[PDB]
């Protein structure tokens, strides 16, 4: 019925029922305006424009939870790559050694850092993001589960080493809790999303990094999926286009978004036959 209802750091309650405010960023704002006129219009939350809240700009979005009765939510980070190629450029010309990310890496695996990273107590952003891709399913399957918010109020972000196809299947199995109608509805929606992406003018002309698919369902068997988070989705130069399936290699700007979606549909289709 509301995301802000579950909250109780980039979101704020809107004044209008059914909406939510997201801290406005230029890349995301650009993206949402273009998407409202794209094939993908229905695959993303409604973008109603910008509002100032305490001398501060917010995107006015559809709250995707508004139609659900006690929503279960799963955030699935899409792509084989989760950072812009410019992060590699910045990390070589002028590294901003991130002590925070060394610490976050240390927590998951104190042995992961190199001799020199240990000595710096700091890693580069790209190295941290590449490590996170490789110990999750991101690198091999082209997506990863980031978190779940349940109908019993229980939330979990404990998926950093969820990597095998079967490990990911078991998360979706637990998430859908035997609801065949929810799983069929998710699969019908993902098939239609994949069809829409494959014809989208926006999708062919944009490097889609850092975006998620948000799975939402309730005990009344309502089920929806939307693309969210266009903060790192960037227009390709001139008339360049991506296939969104081929492997990333610095300079080709490939995201493996549709490799992710192909695998995701594959795993849900497997689960539906179990
Ligand atoms: O937050 P989501 O989209 O799930 O994931 C993207 C974000 O992942 C975070 O890592 P963990 O998920 O392991 O905590 C990074 O610290 C954060 O980066 P910074 O630390 O802010 O530089 C990055 O974000 P970005 O800045 O939007 O690229
Ligand atoms: N339009 C929306 N309606 C409802 N919940 C949303 C919406 N957008 C995001 N969320 C929730 O907020 C979380 C983070 O959203 P996201 O766009 O990735 O923010 P960020 O840019 O801070 O990473 C999602 O995983 C989901 O739980
Ligand atoms: Mn995000
Ligand atoms: Mn973001």
Curated annotation (Swiss-Prot):
Record-listed Phosphoserine modification sites: 10
Enzyme class: transferase
Function: Catalyzes the phosphorylation of 1D-myo-inositol 1,4,5-trisphosphate (InsP3) into 1D-myo-inositol 1,3,4,5-tetrakisphosphate and participates to the regulation of calcium homeostasis.
Gene Ontology MF terms in the entry: ATP binding; calcium/calmodulin-dependent protein kinase activity; calmodulin binding; inositol hexakisphosphate kinase activity; inositol-1,4,5-trisphosphate 3-kinase activity; small GTPase binding
Single GO BP term: actin cytoskeleton organization
Keywords: ATP-binding, Calmodulin-binding, Cytoplasm, Cytoskeleton, Kinase, Methylation, Nucleotide-binding, Phosphoprotein, Transferase
UniProt name for this protein: Inositol-trisphosphate 3-kinase A
EC number: 2.7.1.127
The gene coding this protein: ITPKA
Localization annotation: Cytoplasm, Cytoskeleton
